[PDB]
Design an enzyme around this catalytic site. Structure first.
Site, PDB file in Angstrom:
ATOM      1  CD  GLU A 177      -1.618  -6.469  11.455  1.00 46.92           C
ATOM      2  OE1 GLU A 177      -1.164  -6.045  12.471  1.00 46.92           O
ATOM      3  OE2 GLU A 177      -2.757  -5.827  10.773  1.00 46.92           O
TER       4      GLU A 177
ATOM      5  CD  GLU B 298       0.987  -1.041   4.400  1.00 47.56           C
ATOM      6  OE1 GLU B 298       1.376  -1.328   5.388  1.00 47.56           O
ATOM      7  OE2 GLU B 298      -0.089  -0.864   3.858  1.00 47.56           O
TER       8      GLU B 298
ATOM      9  CE  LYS C  45      -0.101   1.138   7.633  1.00 41.72           C
ATOM     10  NZ  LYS C  45       0.347  -0.211   7.937  1.00 41.72           N
TER      11      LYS C  45
ATOM     12  CD  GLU D 123       3.910   0.025  12.650  1.00 38.92           C
ATOM     13  OE1 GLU D 123       3.109  -0.205  11.734  1.00 38.92           O
ATOM     14  OE2 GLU D 123       4.191   0.094  13.698  1.00 38.92           O
TER      15      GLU D 123
END
Length: 312
Positions: free
Chosen positions: A236, A286, A289, A294
């Protein structure tokens, strides 16, 4: 380059559209955080190379139940092989050394490796675990890199296993969090690959960017525990485009991720001979999250519009 396919939004495209989007952008590799059956079906015949995680809820069983690793590999790998181009199984994500599941990682890795080996897949599909950079004690300069004592107790046996099988260690690496954690010390250009000249002179090794400094601290740590020949895969790396301070912006996220793509082919100062394999976190914003940064690590919005243009 690879991209992490996170699925925790309520409004993302179906996996088949996501695979098409990978292919049309010439993205070569994908990380999945669990063996989602819709995703694995969509990946058939795509030629996208796959880093597949064992979910945290499965690790203990794969360690402790002698039938479990074989069953897991037969369901999630053998059933999709060779149409799905598996490359790694990552046994756990950020579990070392603090998680109560850390004790099950190496046993699960061994049992998965045995199942893959019996099928003749132990070469193309390598078995590892993904760690965060919290496993490091010392990290400045990069050549001082060493695992903490707690991390070493788990990682020394794991690294012996990796070295014996020709597998890499997977590490989630974020210059972003080093920047926000150290205001006035770590500069924004250093983090974004646009620093001018050498920021850290480390003997023969010159560090112009923060990505290289973090990754090479891990290489230095690996060399102390029988891991000199163990590669690092960056499983990541990314930069949030909103939800934080002023430097969580689309401009800076574009700079970080585009520059990463232009950087990795040359390797690092300690390991310049080969491209560093890296996975950008992540494909989509997303929205399930935690509120803030995030929710904003995506290369693409839910409707597939780029958040910022990237050449992969």
């Amino acid at each position: 380059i690879g991209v992490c396919y996170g699925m925790l939004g309520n409004n993302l495209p179906p996996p088949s559209e996501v695979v098409s989007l990978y292919k049309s952008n010439n993205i070569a590799r994908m990380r999945l955080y669990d063996p989602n059956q819709a995703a694995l079906q969509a990946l058939r015949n795509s030629n996208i190379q796959v880093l597949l995680d064992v979910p945290r809820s499965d690790v203990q069983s794969l360690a402790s139940n002698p039938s479990a690793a074989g069953d897991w590999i037969r369901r999630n790998v053998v059933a999709y092989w060779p149409s799905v181009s598996f490359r790694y199984i990552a046994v756990g994500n950020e579990l070392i050394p603090g998680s109560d599941l850390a004790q099950y990682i190496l046993p699960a890795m061994r049992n998965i490796y045995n199942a893959l080996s019996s099928a003749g897949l132990q070469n193309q599909i390598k078995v590892s675990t993904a760690v965060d950079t919290g496993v490091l004690g010392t990290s400045y300069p990069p050549s001082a890199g060493a695992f903490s004592s707690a991390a070493q107790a788990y990682l020394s046996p794991i690294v012996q296993f990796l070295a014996s099988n020709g597998a890499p260690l997977l590490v989630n690496v974020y210059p972003y969090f080093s920047y926000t954690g150290n205001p006035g010390q770590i500069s924004l250009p250093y983090a974004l690959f646009t620093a001018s000249g050498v920021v850290v002179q480390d003997g023969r090794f010159s560090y112009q960017n923060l990505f290289d400094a973090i990754v090479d601290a891990v290489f230095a740590a690996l060399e102390r525990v029988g891991g000199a020949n163990v590669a690092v895969v960056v499983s990541e790396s990314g930069w949030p485009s909103a939800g934080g301070g002023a430097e969580a912006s689309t401009s800076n996220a574009q700079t970080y991720n585009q520059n990463l793509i232009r950087h990795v082919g040359g390797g690092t100062p300690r390991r310049p001979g080969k491209e560093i394999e890296a996975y950008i976190f992540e494909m989509f914003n997303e929205n399930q999250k935690a509120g803030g940064i995030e929710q904003n690590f995506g290369l693409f919005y839910p409707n597939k519009q780029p958040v910022y243009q990237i050449s992969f």
